Structure 1
Amino acid sequence: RSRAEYVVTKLDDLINWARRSSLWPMTFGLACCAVEMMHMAAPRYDMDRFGVVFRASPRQADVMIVAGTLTNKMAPALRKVYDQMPEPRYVVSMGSCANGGGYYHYSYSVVRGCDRIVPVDIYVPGCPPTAEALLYGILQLQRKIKREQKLKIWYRR
């Protein structure tokens, strides 16, 4: 193909490499799934070794790991801290509660899955999913944003 197309593809690879090697989650959790999330932070699995480091403010966050039961009282707050994240942001639902309500699906005060509130990039199943499974979801998200072709789509526009 064109020489400029190759340059654009390599720039896409570089941008995707940077964004997948530096994934900072918001220090945000709701329940037992967030307990497994800090067990992923624990020395056995070392998200920091993978380059994944928690940041407290949503402004410095890249991904949002919805780890727990999203209730009706919590949903505006979750939407607010999602909206306050800057644009290259991703969402990892974790556990059956955040996926589709889970054990509290038919409850009066539970949002039936956080995908009703925020656009979810990756769903991690389990109750709780193990820290292995959450780490697998993080690596799958890294592959997904490695697959992104933003500058190539912009060039083909």
Structure 2
Amino acid sequence: DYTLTEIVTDPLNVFMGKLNDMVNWGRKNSIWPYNFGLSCCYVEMVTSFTAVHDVARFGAEVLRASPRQADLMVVAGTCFTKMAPVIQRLYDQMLEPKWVISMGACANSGGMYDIYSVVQGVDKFIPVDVYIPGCPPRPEAYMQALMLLQESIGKERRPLSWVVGDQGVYRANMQSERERKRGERIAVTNLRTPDEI
């Protein structure tokens, strides 16, 4: 159960599988996000970058001002109509492999701003790999999205070289986190009363 860019099966010799696993390990353990500030969600992103959360521990603190060196585009903020061509150009300037995380309800769907000057979600014009609900998501939600992206990266198939082998990108069809956590979420009975601290 994969997606080729069509639903196909897993294409994965045993040495090529080990090489692909090593490449995916190196890619997921070294993710360089692009420094792009749209709105309040970017403030929570850079809060995750600071000392009290330390996103550097996952190897994802090298925040690039150049889209060429960046691997991850975190659309963290509202996709305004004037800013949408800028977002598309900065996404186009990136290099393969590239991943996209929508952070916050604005980047997910437009959020509360179903208004004349807001594009209703960044998936309207760029492909998104991981969505985060929240307005804003807290910094550890951004960390959890980073681990979700790492798990998605570790099970995708990409060409090792541009001259040898199949050049198609096979992205795994992961189980939804809603269906995965439905076992533990429904079983919750009692929560702490809000009058305490």
Normalised by the size of structure 1, how large is the TM-score? 0.91
Structure 2 unmatched ranges of 5 or more: 1-11, 168-197
Q: Could you tell me which of 102, 106, 113 is aligned with 1:97?
A: 106
Does residue 84 (structure 1) correspond to residue 84 (structure 2)? The answer is: no
Higher relative contact order by CA 8 Å / sep ≥ 6: 1 or 2?
1
The equivalent residue for 2:134 is: 126
Does residue 141 (structure 1) correspond to residue 135 (structure 2)? The answer is: no
Q: Distance in 1 between matches of 2:111 and 2:16?
A: 43
Does residue 109 (structure 1) correspond to residue 117 (structure 2)? The answer is: yes
The equivalent residue for 1:154 is: 166
- Distance apart, 1:5 and its partner CA: 1.6
The equivalent residue for 1:69 is: 78
Q: Could you tell me which of 43, 53, 59 is aligned with 1:45?
A: 53
Does residue 34 (structure 1) correspond to residue 46 (structure 2)? The answer is: no
Normalised by the size of structure 2, how large is the TM-score? 0.73
Q: Distance in 1 between matches of 2:158 and 2:126?
A: 22
The equivalent residue for 2:67 is: 58
Moved more, 42-51 or 93-102: 42-51
- Distance apart, 1:151 and its partner CA: 4.7
Matched length: 151
Q: Deviations over 1:2-59 (max 9, x none)?
A: xx92111101110001111110011012111001001100112212121002111001
Q: Distance in 2 between matches of 1:17 and 1:44?
A: 26
Q: Deviations over 1:104-123 (max 9, x none)?
A: 02x00100000012111110
State the structure with more CA Rg: 2
Structure 1 unmatched ranges of 5 or more: none
Specify which structure has the higher proportion of helix.
1
